[PDB]
Design a protein around this nucleic acid. Structure first.
Ligand SMILES: [Mg+2]
Ligand SMILES: [Mg+2]
Ligand SMILES: [Mg+2]
Ligand SMILES: [Mg+2]
Ligand SMILES: [Mg+2]
Ligand SMILES: [Mg+2]
Ligand SMILES: [Mg+2]
Ligand SMILES: [Mg+2]
Lengths: 239, 213, 239, 213
RNA sequence: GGGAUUUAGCUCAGUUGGGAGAGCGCCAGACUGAAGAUCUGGAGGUCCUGUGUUCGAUCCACAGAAUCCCCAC
RNA sequence: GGGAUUUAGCUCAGUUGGGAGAGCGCCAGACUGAAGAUCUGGAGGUCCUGUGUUCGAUCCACAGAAUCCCCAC
């Protein structure tokens, strides 16, 4: 007869994935470029950075594309309580994005926890990057089919059956070359921490000493996670 | 999948209680009044109303006081999925409140599901209102003695009963008996007609059951 | 890094449904009559009664058919802890059935908790009784198709697509009249408590006094739960 | 559906610990010895082996002492569904044990999942073995002083350290230092070759990690 | 609604920033015919956790955890 | 591995079975110029929960819950 879900806990490592609820209806039509708008993509990335920076929570890094963000945690607040983490994080992101996009009508993120083994972490972000690719192809495919004259649900149903390579070949034949499009559209964006060597004055030693500062960086030209270039890339992020 | 809680569910009826994460620290840094603020109070109520009207999740009514809101659901959104309900509702409220107060820095609500039986619904809101009262007296007692620091005010407030807090506060120009009802008892936003009630009765001395019909 | 599921709790009213895991392989071939064996059905019913009687747990009644049993609880042991209840109950049932069937090879029940509103309880047992009916029709349908010459998986796949009335009509045309078969096969069995007025001696009063004794009874001729006869039947059980 | 926990899951690796529900009360009523019984001990070990061999769920190995068994799973059965894993395993063990002891009255195991990290697997079994030792000394101290009642034996046993329990038990013809290793440390049943080890080492003074490979 | 506590096995100090101590207790030693007591040496540290600020954090900032308590009930 | 506790707002009694009490405290009353103290009356009960046994359960049987504690760590 109580708050029975409040004792549900998760154990690190854990990924939190937040996804915009019905964003193509709640963020339209407010003048966003179709099919992609870099202003929105930047807002998503900045939202992720603001969370890492000032939420008080400490995710290692973030991977965002479309309207979703995945945060990797090796340490969890609220003793790993699922309700606490999902609600607070989704609420912070909803608020932050509302500010950066200067919205006048409310939006919402959902949130869910993905329990992983340490060794499984590269596999998770690979799966999400695959989703990013299909999202990328389907978005441009939808944009083309709609403007040519196909109905909203006709184009929607059409793309869900077709595979990623098929729609890609379709855009090809229509004069739409996806290989020229920016990397952030195709592979998404990484928000992580990188080391920065600095110099300060030890008033005692009377000398200059070297220390390190971890600064938050957005990478808009990331590699393919499952590749010879991508494996050590992810490996360094996860450390 | 590895989404091991994603299909954890609740059954109707259910109550979602959302509570502002560290609001008193945050909003004070923005210039809001303590322990209560009318502008914030209206924003909370408007946020609740906007949720009832615009979320599409259709709660019966909401009860709000301080920085918390409780929603009663008789029909369940998102197939009763706990993670989705807690996160989406908390996110909507966070976004809505941000808009109402036009904040320039992000805030956050938490959210939990209270799996009540139908018989216990009036009991829950009664206890919430009791909490509203104890918080009303305690926070006014504390945040008035701080005009003296944290541990000083608390140590000063140790063991003195409610009536003594009233008399103590009155000598320092604070009259608990005449402060607005939204501070003492909270605010009800209910349902198509949506109404805010800023002068509610005490719950446990039939009003609620009649409200739920 | 702990027993994180041990604080998962449920709230009454609740139905526990236990179902035999792979029973048609783990209980075969030990000479059971096909497609139905009343010895097995009695073992299931007696297992349910033994649980109500001597497990220390207090379900109101039980509904069993095939290899499943549903117990209605209005009060829960272990503070409603899901892991505790599922494991202990399934273990008790597995042990009890092992005894009554005199098994030499181990079997297993699964178990799951069904959270209900008080008003929803008749709906649950209706759904299960529907399942009992489909189970009944499909069992006889499978028995007929197999003996006629159809393969194990051919007959299995065949029945899953066909509806209950269709297979029923099939048995009809084959000379198999399901309407003549016993009620326990078609609708299952209820195990519940009924009041029994008794008489004892108050040594003080020197007179005979009347008190009540709740005795556990098996009903092998139950009505259809969703009918004018069935609604008050269930209503009295749930009280 | 209303099966609100049916899709709650865990991830590998995981440990299932099953513990006999009220075994000491039950099995004593059947004539078994207290606090330990060789016949019961063999039945527990055989039950564990039979599970590893015949369940199809394929655990790496099992550690048993008293009336509990811990199984290590590196690959998850039933898609990691908690309710199904706890119930089916507990049911299998209950059935298996019933067969091994040829009981005429039903018994029951409980079961819980211990969501350990891979790093912590040796730590878990070490703590379990520590529990095995503390239970070995305590139960022998208690169930020997009862030959004197419940509260008497406990009150008698209050505050006396382990060494004092040893000396106390020796004067009454009970030598803890020479009792079998399966009482002191427990039994390992591991893996295709399945082996029972009734003379195991102390875990935390590399054996386990080598066992898990 | 609020406060306090968290540091060696145990009970507790640490100048609001320059690499953390005491007392019981434990180990060893001598005092010597031997203990027991007392002196000496020794061992014991996730300064509750995470992230920041800083040349540097037990200490400050942000966000958390656990325990006790006031109010309330 | 074990023990103990659970009863009025609070602290606690109840013959191992015939419808549960005390003390603080509260309410009222008098003692009277008034309190404060003391006498009187009064109010307060999920006898922790569920199911059994019994004509009858705070009490016995079976199974649970919460808190404290020993052992262990
Ligand atoms: Mg979306
Ligand atoms: Mg999306
Ligand atoms: Mg708050
Ligand atoms: Mg609050
Ligand atoms: Mg089955
Ligand atoms: Mg079945
Ligand atoms: Mg046990
Ligand atoms: Mg045990």
């Amino acid at each position: 007869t109580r708050e029975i879900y409040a004792e549900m806990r998760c154990i690190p490592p854990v990924v939190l994935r937040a996804d915009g609820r019905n964003f193509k209806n709640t963020l339209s039509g407010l003048g966003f470029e179709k099919p992609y708008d870099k202003t929105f993509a930047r807002a998503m990335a900045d939202t992720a950075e603001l969370f890492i920076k000032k939420s008080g929570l400490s995710p290692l890094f973030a991977y965002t594309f479309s309207d979703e963000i995945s945060f990797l945690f090796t340490d969890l607040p609220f003793d790993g309580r699922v309700e606490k983490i999902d609600s607070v994080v989704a609420s912070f992101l909803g608020s932050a994005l509302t500010i950066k996009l200067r919205l006048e009508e409310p939006i919402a993120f959902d949130s869910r926890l993905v329990a992983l083994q340490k060794e499984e972490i590269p596999e998770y972000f690979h799966r999400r990057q695959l989703e990013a690719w299909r999202n990328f192809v389907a978005s441009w495919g939808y944009y083309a089919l709609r403007n040519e004259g196909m109905g909203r649900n006709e184009a929607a149903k059409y793309l869900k059956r077709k595979k990623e390579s098929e729609i890609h070949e379709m855009l090809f034949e229509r004069g739409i070359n996806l290989a020229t499009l920016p990397s952030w559209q195709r592979r998404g964006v990484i928000i992580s921490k990188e080391a920065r060597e600095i110099q300060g004055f030890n008033p005692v030693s009377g000398k200059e000493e070297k220390s390190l500062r971890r600064k938050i960086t957005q990478n808009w030209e990331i590699p393919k996670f499952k590749s010879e270039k991508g494996i050590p890339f992810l490996e360094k992020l996860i450390n």
